[PDB]
Amino acid sequence: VMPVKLAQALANPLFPALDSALRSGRHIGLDELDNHAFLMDFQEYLEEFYARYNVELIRAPEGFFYLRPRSTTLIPRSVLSELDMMVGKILCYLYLSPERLANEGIFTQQELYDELLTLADEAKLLKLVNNRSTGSDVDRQKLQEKVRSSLNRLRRLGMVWFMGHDSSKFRITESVFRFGADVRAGDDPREAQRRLIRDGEAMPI
Amino acid sequence: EQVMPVKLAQALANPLFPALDSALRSGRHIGLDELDNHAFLMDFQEYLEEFYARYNVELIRAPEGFFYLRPRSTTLIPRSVLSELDMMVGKILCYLYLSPERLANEGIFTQQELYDELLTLADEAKLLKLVNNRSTGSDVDRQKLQEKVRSSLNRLRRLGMVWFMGHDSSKFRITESVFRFGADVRAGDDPREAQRRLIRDGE
Amino acid sequence: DLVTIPRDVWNDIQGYIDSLERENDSLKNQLMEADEYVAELEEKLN
Amino acid sequence: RDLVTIPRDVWNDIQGYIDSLERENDSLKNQLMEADEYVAELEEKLN
Amino acid sequence: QLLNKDWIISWGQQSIDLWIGYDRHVHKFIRTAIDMDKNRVFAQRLRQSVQTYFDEPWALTYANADRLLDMR
Amino acid sequence: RLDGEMSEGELVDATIGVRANNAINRFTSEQAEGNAIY
């Protein structure tokens, strides 16, 4: 009928919050002590259950959890635009910045924006922002607002915890390591990208 | 605590459940047509009413036999509200289902009839505001209005009120689930009069 | 009748509320200027 | 660690508030995209 | 910088707590990062990938269940 | 003040935000308003 531990866990009053949160994409980091402990105790049976939905449960080596739908899933999937991926990669770097340690892990969006413009080909972001823009102040401000919108979209997924009563700061969680799957392996990024596609991690765009 | 009632587990174990759960949480008005789903719900109604309560959601069976999920202000599952024009289309579909000609047509109607019904029994100015707040009242506006009416009909088909027939989208059949848009007119007067009054009042 | 929440969760909720409010306020002006641009283009075309 | 104690009647308010903001923001996103398509069509008409 | 090279009464109490938090953070960072890329290759590769990213865009996936529809 | 430790908010009260930060340019304390103690 049902495994004993699966039945016992399902009755746990903490379950509904997770069940609704995970199927909306939320990644679970180490911070949420109670939720993470619950998942640790009952990983096997939860994985078995969701596998009936035709969706997969993944625990990457870093220690987080996330839901990955397969081709024939019974719950839809979705992706995110290029700008969000850019912001995610930048966030991934800041986590690793050895000079950052003075900041204890708290950051500010001003640094995020300033750093970003040191890498991306200025126009190649402007075109995604506005074709007519060629470094004007107004379009720079427009991009400044677009990055905030992307960051809110990212937080909803669980990559960053906001802090304090002022939005101009935030904290990064270890779930950002996902954005590095491209460079995880030492082989040519292209074949690795196709391998990721085959595994279902990412779809080409 | 009481970990699990036997019947609750037996119900969750039925192989067909997962699709039903995913559809329900999408709000679909599971009805009689799905004889299997209807039977399964009939067997284990009360216990599924009990379980979903933890989500702060009421599993309500309407008088006419169909089932749908109605959450409260404190839902633990995200909820979204559809646009007004969708509600107008829903009400119009409610009216047609009562037409005596349904038996003659076996319930087969084509999008042209629905579009004409909307246009003739709906205010042109309100619709022109709906289609585009900058609309000039020209034809292109009416063509885009037809396009969005088609899109809304598709969304409603996703809700499960109506069925597409064969492999051509031009033919569809209505089911008894449409009353969710007519339960407000449950009074014993003429359905036409009640719907006309509601539409005149803007309700 | 009383709910207890960890300090971190409440802080996160408040920060997110403020961020969302600021984003919405900004986007309002964004739409306003876009519509004004459309209106100006239409007026100049005529 | 530290905790905050709150009554339900107050807690429910912020939960409603954030959801309303999210829905309004998404609707505005859609309307802005539609306006963008219109302006693009006008621009290609002009040129 | 060392890592970069190679891979009245109440005030005292508060400063002590801040220092303890600092040490906790440095321990967390060492555990999470240095073991993973003990040879620093990961960060350089990420730098270059972002720099040459536009040559082949791509996007990853995340489950997004459809929201519940409701009326007024 | 009896606390003996000032937070960033008090300083900013004393492009407003950006100019203030540039003027400032420290002990982080997440539990303090603004998460900064000087």
- Exposed / middle / buried, residue A66 (Cβ in 10 Å: 0-12, 13-18, 19+): buried
Q: A80-187: which CATH number, 1.10.10.2260, 3.30.830.10, 3.30.1330.60, 3.40.50.300?
A: 1.10.10.2260
The CATH class of the A2-70 domain is mainly alpha
φ, ψ at E52 (rounded to 5°)? -105, 20
What is the C-alpha separation between B1 and A12, in angstroms, rounded? 9
Strand partners, B161: none
Query: What does CATH list as the number for B4-72?
Result: 1.10.10.2250
F27, F37 Cβ separation under 8 angstroms:
yes
β-strand pairing of A169-172 with B57-61: unpaired
What is the C-alpha separation between A116 and A128, in angstroms, rounded? 14
C-alpha torsion E49→A176→A103→A109, nearest 10? 80
Alpha helices by DSSP H, listed for chain B, are 6-12, 17-25, 35-43, 45-52, 84-97, 101-105, 111-121, 124-131, 139-159, 191-201
Q: What is the DSSP string of D23-47?
A: HHHHHHHHHHHHHHHHHHHHHHHH-
Identify all chain E residues contacting A89, using CB atoms and an 8 Å cutoff: 46, 49-50, 53
For D3-32, give one letter per residue: b (16+ CB within 10 A) or e. eeeeeeeeeeeeeeeeeebbeebeebeeee
In the structure, do chain A and chain B come into contact, i.e. share 3 or more CB pairs under 8 Å?
yes
C-alpha torsion A133→A136→A139→A141, nearest 10? 160
Interface test with F, best of E14, E16, E19, E22 (most F CBs within 10 A): E14
Which residues of F make CB contacts under 8 Å with E?
4-5, 27-29, 37
What is the C-alpha separation between A169 and B70, in angstroms, rounded? 38
In the structure, do chain B and chain F come into contact, i.e. share 3 or more CB pairs under 8 Å?
no
Domain ranges of chain A: 2-70, 80-187
Closest CA to A87 of E55, E59, E4: E59
How would you write chain E as a 3-class SS string? CHHHHCCCHHHHHHHHHHHHHHHHHHHHHHHHHHCCCCCCHHHHHHHHHHHCHHHCCEEECEECCCCEEECC
Task: Indicate yes or no: CB of C42 within 8 angstroms of CB of D42.
Answer: yes
Facing E3 at nearest CB: one of A75, A89, A98: A98
CATH T-level assignment (fold) for domain B82-189: Arc Repressor Mutant, subunit A (1.10.10)
Task: Indicate yes or no: CB of A167 within 8 angstroms of CB of C15.
Answer: yes
What is the C-alpha separation between C30 and B57, in angstroms, rounded? 38
Measure the CA angle with vertex A178, ends A176 and A180; round to 5°.
100
Q: Please name the chains neighbouring A, where neighbouring means 3+ C-beta pairs under 8 angstroms.
A: B, C, E, F
In sequence order, the 6+-apart residues with CB closer than 8 A to the CB of A153 are: A80, A84
What is the C-alpha separation between F3 and E11, in angstroms, rounded? 9
Task: Give the count of beta carbons closer than 10 Å to the beta carbon of residue A103.
Answer: 15
Asked whether the domain spanning B82-189 has the same topology as the one spanning B4-72, the reply is: yes
The strand ranges marked E within C1-46 are 2-6
φ, ψ at A57 (rounded to 5°)? -115, 125
* One-letter amino acid of A157: L
Using left for φ > 0, alpha for ψ between -120 and 50, and beta otherwise, residue B202 falls in: left
The alpha-carbon radius of gyration of chain F (Å, integer) is: 10
Task: Give the neighbor-by-neighbor strand order of the sheet with A169-172.
Answer: A106-108, A169-172, A160-162
The minimum CA-CA distance between E62 and chain A, rounded to whole Å, is 5
| CA separation, residue B2 to residues A7, A11, A35, C36, E9 (Å) | 11, 8, 21, 63, 53
A67, E63 Cβ separation under 8 angstroms:
yes
What is the C-alpha separation between B101 and B92, in angstroms, rounded? 15
Facing A167 at nearest CB: one of C8, C22, C30: C22
Task: Indicate yes or no: CB of E42 within 8 angstroms of CB of A183.
Answer: yes
C34 touches chain A (CB under 8 A): no
Q: Which tokens go with D24?
A: 């309004």
Closest CA to A143 of A133, A153, A156: A133
Q: Which tokens go with E36?
A: 């993973």
Task: Indicate yes or no: CB of F4 within 8 angstroms of CB of E18.
Answer: no
Closest CA to A103 of E25, F34, C9: E25
Task: Give the count of beta carbons closer than 10 Å to the beta carbon of residue B10.
Answer: 15
Closest CA to C16 of A169, A142, B80: A169
What is the C-alpha separation between D17 and A189, in angstroms, rounded? 44
Task: Indicate yes or no: CB of D11 within 8 angstroms of CB of C3.
Answer: yes
* One-letter amino acid of B91: K
Using left for φ > 0, alpha for ψ between -120 and 50, and beta otherwise, residue E40 falls in: left
C10, D10 Cβ separation under 8 angstroms:
no
The single-letter DSSP state of residue A47 is H
Task: Give the count of beta carbons closer than 10 Å to the beta carbon of residue E13.
Answer: 9
Helix (H, G, I), strand (E, B) or coil at B68: strand
Q: Which tokens go with C27?
A: 């986007």
Strand partners, B174: B162
F16, A168 Cβ separation under 8 angstroms:
no
E22, A104 Cβ separation under 8 angstroms:
yes
Strand partners, B108: B173
What is the C-alpha separation between B120 and B122, in angstroms, rounded? 6
A76, E65 Cβ separation under 8 angstroms:
yes
The span from the first CA to the last CA of chain D, in angstroms, equals 63
